[PDB]
Amino acid sequence: QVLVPNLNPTPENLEVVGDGFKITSSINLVGEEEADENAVNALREFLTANNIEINSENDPNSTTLIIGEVDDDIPELDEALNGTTAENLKEEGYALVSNDGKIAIEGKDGDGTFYGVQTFKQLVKESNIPEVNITDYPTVSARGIVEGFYGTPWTHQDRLDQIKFYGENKLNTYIYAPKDDPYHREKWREPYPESEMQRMQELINASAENKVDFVFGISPGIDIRFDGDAGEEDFNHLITKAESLYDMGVRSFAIYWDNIQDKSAAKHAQVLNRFNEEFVKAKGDVKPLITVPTEYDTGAMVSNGQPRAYTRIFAETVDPSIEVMWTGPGVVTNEIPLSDAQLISGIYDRNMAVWWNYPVTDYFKGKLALGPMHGLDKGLNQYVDFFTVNPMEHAELSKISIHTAADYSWNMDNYDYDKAWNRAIDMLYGDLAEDMKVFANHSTRMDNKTWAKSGREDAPELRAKMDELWNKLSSKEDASALIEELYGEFARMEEACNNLKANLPEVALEECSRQLDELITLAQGDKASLDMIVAQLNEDTEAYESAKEIAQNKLNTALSSFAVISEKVAQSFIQEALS
Amino acid sequence: LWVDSTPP
Ligand SMILES: *[C@@H]1O[C@H](CO)[C@@H](O)[C@H](O)[C@H]1NC(C)=O
């Protein structure tokens, strides 16, 4: 019997229907001449990578794999689904069935067929597949990443890797909008050089290969002129730029207005509407235009239940076809409750797009944001139809958070942040997942002490034990069992972080080594903190003073190092013990 | 001005 492995995202409807089977050494492939080109290539690569030949002539002893879209006239597929259909599903959905030596994939469309193969790829372990009946489809129909942070833009290879990763997790959107790319913002009028354009072409091609809608962003807000001959000239500049990316295959565009001095709401929206008419609609194979207003968090948009001036005029003028992005109640913020969605959607008489600013860390660069999607309402799909996260300048470790994004936006009402968090790390880290959880667990909360606060609280079960110790100590109860429990946790953080340092691949390790060092320092200072507690209990002053120097030395090292981790837990524990 | 989205 073959267990269903970890799947991401969680398919909507899955049922085990059999004991499972081993897929034979080579397989009959059916419908691959009519099925989505990209789904077939995904399937082809996976089969090659796992040493599974495709037969030329049908072999009735071989596992048979049938693939195609609803709109393909292929009746051998309908027979293999055994009454399961993708016809009645929403766009991007698919059905998948494995019983009795056959595997059938019917996508509602090509996108759906590709995602069906992605699921197939996750179900197969060492040739063994479970026998199941799936129908699956996304809650939110635009899902992915806006590369829109300040600081060092992702490299070409970062982006190429990211896009393979989106495909494998059914994320369909990638917005190219890095703040520090001069040709995106500071110098938005200027053409990309020929070699930068050749890296774009590779990016566009890999997007299409992976079913990702590549969105070309531009932020002209710095200095765009709106009126007369200058307004024309500057508008023609948007057009030439968008057109040169159109000419390489781009079919989604964004025009952004965040973090700029000019607050001409009508002018902003007028530029959007013009571009929408003269480019987006005229081209006719271009997806809806995307934007972010100069006011983009509820705090900056709304005053005492009512839109501020900029927002109100912007919402009045902006064509209903355009996607408007907002970050929630603040820029970086604990939650988007349903009621916040409802309020903003209301001002806009439309379904909104979320620009979720987590795991981005450009505003507090010493800490890694390595937790799940958190504080996002599970009924958010009522007012949101477009969901993207803003990742860290660290592409590799951004994967943990984004992994949970795939799950939240695909299967929203089923989303369980802690389960999805454990899954992400289980799927990404393999042999090292247990240790990676130990470390990552301390690096989920982002807090700059002023305007930016978001994410699941750092290692909460450990904070709870830390608090039950001070409770048991001040009300003089026997704490000696908690103390031994805590020595274990602290020794474990050190053991785990050392294992990560020894065994993480360069790609991960080059992103988080300073924070591993930081957590070992804190774990060690926590151990001494406990030693300080125990020598206070034992009225032993020689041993208290020297565990106090050690604790002070560790905390001194963590406070002045660049790396930041576990501020309110492992770090605060040492500050607590020194009073 | 503008190295993150610090409010004004
Ligand atoms: C402001 O917020 C984040 C965090 O600094 C930043 O990366 C982003 O580019 C800015 N814009 C928006 C719309 O969030």
Numbering used by the authors:
A (entry chain A): 40 to 618
B (entry chain P): 145 to 152
Task: Give sentences copied directly from the paper behind this entry.
Reversible protein O-GlcNAcylation is achieved by the action of two enzymes, O-GlcNAc transferase (OGT) and O-GlcNAcase (OGA). Although it is unclear whether CpOGA is a physiological OGA, it shows significant in vitro O-GlcNAcase activity on O-GlcNAc proteins in lysates from human cell lines and possesses a putative substrate-binding groove conserved with hOGA (Rao et al., 2006; Schimpl et al., 2010). We report the molecular details of the interaction of a bacterial O-GlcNAcase homolog with three different synthetic glycopeptides derived from characterized O-GlcNAc sites in the human proteome. In addition to extensive contacts with the sugar, O-GlcNAcase recognizes the peptide backbone through hydrophobic interactions and intramolecular hydrogen bonds, while avoiding interactions with the glycopeptide side chains.
To investigate the molecular basis of this substrate specificity, we exploited the catalytic acid mutant of CpOGA, D298N, which is inactive yet unaffected in its ability to bind substrate (Rao et al., 2006). We generated an alternative CpOGA crystal form with a highly accessible active site and determined the structures of CpOGA D298N in complex with the p53-, TAB1-, and hOGA-derived O-GlcNAc peptides. Strikingly, the backbones of all three glycopeptides run in the same direction, together defining the −4 through +3 subsites, and adopt similar conformations near the O-GlcNAc site (maximum Cα shift of 1.8 Å for the −2 to +1 subsites). Notably, all side chains point away from the surface of the enzyme (apart from Trp146 in the p53 peptide, which appears to stack with Asn298 of CpOGA D298N), explaining how a single OGA enzyme is able to recognize >1,000 O-GlcNAc proteins. All three glycopeptides adopt a “V-shaped” conformation that allows the sugar to penetrate the OGA active site. Interestingly, for two of the peptides, this conformation appears to be stabilized by intramolecular hydrogen bonds. For the p53-derived glycopeptide, a hydrogen bond is observed between the aspartic acid in the −1 subsite and the threonine in the +1 subsite. Such intramolecular interactions may stabilize the OGA-bound conformation of these glycopeptides, explaining the significantly lower Kms compared to the TAB1-derived peptide. A notable exception is the tumor suppressor protein p53, where the reported Ser149 O-GlcNAc site resides in a loop that is fully defined in the crystal structure of the p53 DNA binding domain (Cho et al., 1994). Comparing the structure of this loop in the p53 DNA binding domain structure with the glycosylated form reported here, it is apparent that the overall trajectory of the loop is approximately conserved between the two conformations of the peptide (average Cα shift of 2.2 Å), although a number of side chain flips are observed (in particular Trp146).
